[PDB]
Amino acid sequence: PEMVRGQVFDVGPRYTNLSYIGEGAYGMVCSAYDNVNKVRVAIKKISPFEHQTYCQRTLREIKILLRFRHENIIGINDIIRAPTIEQMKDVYIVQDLMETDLYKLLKTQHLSNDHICYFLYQILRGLKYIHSANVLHRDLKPSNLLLNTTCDLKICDFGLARVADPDHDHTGFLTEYVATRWYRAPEIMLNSKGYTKSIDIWSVGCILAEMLSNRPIFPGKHYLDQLNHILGILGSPSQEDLNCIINLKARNYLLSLPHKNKVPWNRLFPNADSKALDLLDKMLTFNPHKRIEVEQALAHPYLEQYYDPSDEPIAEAPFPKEKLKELIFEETARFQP
Ligand SMILES: O=C(CN1Cc2ccc(-c3nc(NC4CCOCC4)ncc3Cl)cc2C1=O)N1CCc2ccccc2CC1
């Protein structure tokens, strides 16, 4: 049984020669040599079984990633676990190894306009498929966009994903939320549970802005500071957009703020392609009803060199800790001999 950083890796003998990569609240990640398909692979040790929310997230991802098949969405190649529930303490998810992610890339590299266009194309192409399955990713951010040495992009981390539920999207003002702060749509802080496809388009808009300057566009330091940053650039909402917020606490908060003028995109991004900034504007629309949809974004002039709806496929099949351990056990059975 190989060891890495105070953790066993029961992955062998198929997978050998491990090197550490990263870790989190309930898992660790290594590269490894796969002896059957003769390549290095990524492996994620997940240890969720003590906690119901980690169980929920592990199960969501497995179920989604096994149903999905798309060039721009990370797949699962293998799952390794003990042969019985009783002996199962960890799950290892095997996936294609990717050179880097967009978070690491943006911290070190200037992107050409051609790179930005191609990355945005692939994000939206993957997202078209995700949304066509009635799924919302709900945590799109640069670190969840993996890249290989030829700049092919795959969306990962479906642990916060939900089935879309637009009729049950409304909530009160300043209702707590789980997804990453800098990529949260303004409506999350006002009146939305993040159950609509528009939540994901806002995150893509933020990612686009961050590709243009190598800096997050809305770097809030805490829940309501996030709205502060958004309004600092978009300006005060229009009368019509306020009228769509019927919740009085959310409405009256916005009414309380001094007038702020829109910062023009071409002032924030003086070297950007004008067509990129037109698409940016449409993704970072304050009102989610007016916000561009994935399929319209793909059809936008900025992406004209790539747009091809016949090669932008859709999904064929849209969608306690003790029982969730069993469902994880059931869902991973197909990888056993
Ligand atoms: O598995 C997740 C969420 N993650 C975290 C992650 C890391 C890495 C990869 C990954 N990276 C690479 N190439 C890296 C090389 C070096 O440059 C960076 C990219 N290639 C393939 C994958 Cl598949 C994918 C994921 C992913 O899907 N969760 C459960 C437990 C856990 C475990 C570890 C960290 C956080 C968490 C919480 C959520």
What domains sit in the chain, N to C, each tagged with a CATH number?
A: 1-97+320-337 (3.30.200.20), 98-319 (1.10.510.10)
CB under 8 Å to 300, separation ≥6 — which residues? 275, 278, 279, 282, 292
3-state secondary structure the chain: CEECCCCEECCCCCEEEEEEEEEECCEEEEEEEECCCCEEEEEEEECCCCCHHHHHHHHHHHHHHHHCCCCCECCCCEEECCCCCCCCCCEEEEEECCCEEHHHHHHHCCCCHHHHHHHHHHHHHHHHHHHHCCEECCCCCHHHEEECCCCCEEECCCCCCEECCHHHCECCCCCCCCCCHHHCCHHHHCCECCCCCHHHHHHHHHHHHHHHHCCCCCCCCCHHHHHHHHHHHHCCCCHHHHHCCCCHHHHHHHHCCCCCCCCCHHHHCCCCCHHHHHHHHHHCCCCCCCCCCHHHHHCCHHHCCCCCHHHCCCCCCCCCHHHHHHHHHHHCHHHCC
Pocket flag, ligand 1, residue 29 (CB < 6 Å): yes
Catalytic residues: 139
In this structure, are residues 42 and 29 in contact, taking their beta carbons and an 8 Å threshold?
Answer: yes
For 311, counting Cβ atoms within 10 Å of its Cβ (0-12 exposed, 13-18 middle, 19+ buried), the class is: exposed
Mutate to test the pocket of ligand 1, among 20, 54, 98, 178 (most ligand atoms within 8 A of CB): 98
**Is 24's C-beta closer than 6 angstroms to any atom of ligand 1?**
yes
User: What resolution in angstrom units was achieved for this structure?
Assistant: 1.9
Q: How many residues does the chain have?
A: 337
